[PDB]
Write an enzyme that holds these catalytic residues in place. Structure first.
Site, PDB file in Angstrom:
ATOM      1  N   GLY B  12       0.851  -1.167   0.000  1.00  0.00           N
ATOM      2  CA  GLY B  12       0.000   0.000   0.000  1.00  0.00           C
ATOM      3  C   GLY B  12       0.881   1.209   0.000  1.00  0.00           C
ATOM      4  O   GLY B  12       0.605   2.156  -0.696  1.00  0.00           O
ATOM      5  N   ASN B  93       5.658  -7.990  11.163  1.00  0.00           N
ATOM      6  CA  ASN B  93       6.538  -7.053  10.481  1.00  0.00           C
ATOM      7  C   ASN B  93       7.943  -7.120  11.003  1.00  0.00           C
ATOM      8  O   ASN B  93       8.925  -6.848  10.267  1.00  0.00           O
ATOM      9  CB  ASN B  93       5.963  -5.641  10.578  1.00  0.00           C
ATOM     10  N   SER B 117       8.646   0.828   7.188  1.00  0.00           N
ATOM     11  CA  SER B 117       7.628   0.006   7.903  1.00  0.00           C
ATOM     12  C   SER B 117       7.480   0.425   9.369  1.00  0.00           C
ATOM     13  O   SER B 117       8.448   0.864  10.009  1.00  0.00           O
ATOM     14  CB  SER B 117       7.932  -1.515   7.879  1.00  0.00           C
ATOM     15  N   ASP B 149       6.072  12.722  10.458  1.00  0.00           N
ATOM     16  CA  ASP B 149       5.808  13.547  11.628  1.00  0.00           C
ATOM     17  C   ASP B 149       6.138  15.001  11.310  1.00  0.00           C
ATOM     18  O   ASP B 149       5.380  15.862  11.621  1.00  0.00           O
ATOM     19  CB  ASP B 149       6.571  13.024  12.875  1.00  0.00           C
ATOM     20  N   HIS B 187       8.302   7.767  16.836  1.00  0.00           N
ATOM     21  CA  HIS B 187       7.425   7.823  15.652  1.00  0.00           C
ATOM     22  C   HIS B 187       6.047   7.270  15.967  1.00  0.00           C
ATOM     23  O   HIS B 187       5.235   6.965  15.085  1.00  0.00           O
ATOM     24  CB  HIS B 187       8.083   7.072  14.473  1.00  0.00           C
TER      25      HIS B 187
END
Lengths: 339, 339
Positions: B12, B93, B117, B149, B187
């Site tokens: 995506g 992940n 990721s 961010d 993050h």
């Protein structure tokens, strides 16, 4: 303040197109529409640090999507897929376009309408006839987006020249090749007519020339094949559609275009030099062609036929093959709606 | 001039990231890799008339994807379905990044590795610890892409100023707000530390300031809710990713970065002024933090701690709360490799 609406914003072309548009410094409002998921996508895109407000809308809110829109991009449509024939594909996209273009007629009749859905050769006439029936058709404001054929022609001219002798090849810049190539006709197969305007390059391609021409003509089929039937060219379609919209948006802002001889698929009888273009293509009654356009304020105000007044014998033969198949494509769209 | 590889190019984030990367003038070769569909996507993008050579590769050809790559982007990771657990989405992940970072250690050990990721707070340590076991870790060359961010802070500072002080709001340019705001830290949620560098806008924001802070911190979850759990911010993640990538690529030439105080999530103990950063965030053993960095030739040559030295009392409080919960994230990622 310019507002762009995207109708079909959640599909395979629609999503990357919406991203590219959010990046345009010429847009001040971006409205995203589709039958599912546009709110989400619009919310995702609103976080990008560019100066346009971006909102997506639900299936029921096409009125809010289109209200005060100056440019409407229609990438909506069913993609190529293995169990779908080109005729069913056509008939479904015909229904999508008529329904979406009818909404434009009700809610933003003065919008510049950029039709991206394929097949462009048959769907633009469906859009025109739909607007004619409502009493809302302005010829300068309905454009079939064929810019991907130019993109590919620019890319392949360099690739074929890199093959034939890297010397002239490594001198080309793919980003500026539109000064050297122009594409006209329709938007599928043999209706596509690539015209290298720089005749030194034709000579230098030598027998690669017909490979070049064929590759531009069949670029759509190459990607379908490369995704084994299960997709067509989405990201490059999005890119070409955004580049073409940026040219329309530049024109709202009284800037000149970047693309030399920028073409779109337009309604000949409603525009200046249109009848001249019909004669030059060898069919005094053909209603559409993709030719170089002159934009004022977002709208096509004339067709530049220069390219047609200096064709090689081979180009004239591409034209006459293209016009024959193109006529049938036009007639196919128009009879599906008019009957 | 430089080859870029993208690992996870059909996902995506990866498809839109691949398109933006095709547009970059700093890329000579663009190589796309995924478990499926990368060939087709690569072929689609190869038609775009920008000068990079774009090739996609099958799941067994990660080696040809990475051969001579200098920059490697890793957007790979799993799409959240409306079911998926916090924990088990990390685990999936975590395994993807370990596998892909090991291929990088083996087939392009000198490459700048840009981890995109999520969760970055845990996935970079995984990346780093994986490369440490192989004895291939170069600390200037592993970067967690946290730019989204900074992008959102730039965007939302303008939006908040517009909502409460239109006069000064309308004088803001979202593309250039990085001169006026820096984001540091981790993050995810309350690990994100937005530092308004232009002190006049803290005043102009007034009672909105906490809402800004909170919007930057919880931006992601805003998008997940708007997609009702069925996705996340793929399009803006791709934008911020290409934007950071482009600063990296810019570093190979005689150009100042565009973004002022550009930050990335990096390994402090391996970098010039890292111990100072550790000192200034008030945990002298914290191994990771997103801070303004200096890139020379694609690599962090030192961390720039200035923003750390002029913190307001509120911003120290953010730093302390963010340090506690960021130590936890880092350890949860080290313990997936070290146990």
């Amino acid at each position: 303040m310019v507002k762009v609406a995207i109708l079909g914003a959640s599909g395979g072309v629609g999503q990357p197109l919406s991203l590219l548009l959010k990046l345009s410094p010429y847009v001040s409002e971006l409205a995203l529409y589709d039958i599912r998921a546009a709110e989400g996508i619009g919310k995702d895109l609103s976080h990008i640090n560019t100066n346009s407000s971006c909102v997506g809308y639900d299936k029921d809110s096409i009125e809010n999507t289109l209200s005060n829109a100056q440019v409407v991009l229609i990438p909506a449509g069913v993609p190529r897929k293995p169990g779908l024939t080109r005729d069913d594909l056509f008939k479904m996209n015909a229904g999508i376009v008529k329904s979406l273009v009818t909404a434009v007629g009700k809610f933003a009749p003065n919008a510049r309408i950029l039709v991206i859905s394929n097949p462009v050769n048959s769907l633009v006439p469906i859009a025109v006839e739909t607007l004619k029936k409502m009493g809302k058709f302005k010829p300068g404001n309905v454009m079939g987006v064929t810019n991907l054929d130019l993109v590919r022609a620019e890319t392949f001219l360099v690739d074929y020249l890199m093959l034939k002798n890297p010397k002239i090849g490594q001198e080309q810049d793919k980003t500026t090749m539109h000064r050297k190539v122009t594409v006209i006709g329709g938007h599928s197969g043999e209706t596509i007519i690539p015209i290298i305007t720089d005749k030194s390059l034709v000579f230098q391609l030598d027998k690669q020339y017909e490979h070049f021409i064929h590759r531009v003509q069949f670029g759509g089929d190459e990607i379908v094949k490369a995704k084994q039937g299960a997709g067509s060219a989405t990201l490059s379609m999005a890119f070409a559609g955004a580049k073409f919209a940026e040219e329309v948006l530049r024109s709202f802002h009284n800037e000149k275009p970047e693309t030399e001889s920028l073409s779109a698929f337009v309604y000949l009888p409603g525009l200046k030099n249109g009848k001249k273009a019909q004669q030059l293509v060898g069919d005094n009654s053909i209603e559409y062609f993709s030719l170089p356009i002159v934009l004022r304020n977002g709208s096509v105000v004339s067709i530049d036929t220069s390219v047609l007044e200096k064709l090689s014998p081979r180009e004239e033969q591409l034209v006459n093959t293209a016009v024959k198949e193109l006529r049938k494509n036009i007639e196919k769209g128009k009879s599906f709606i008019l009957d």
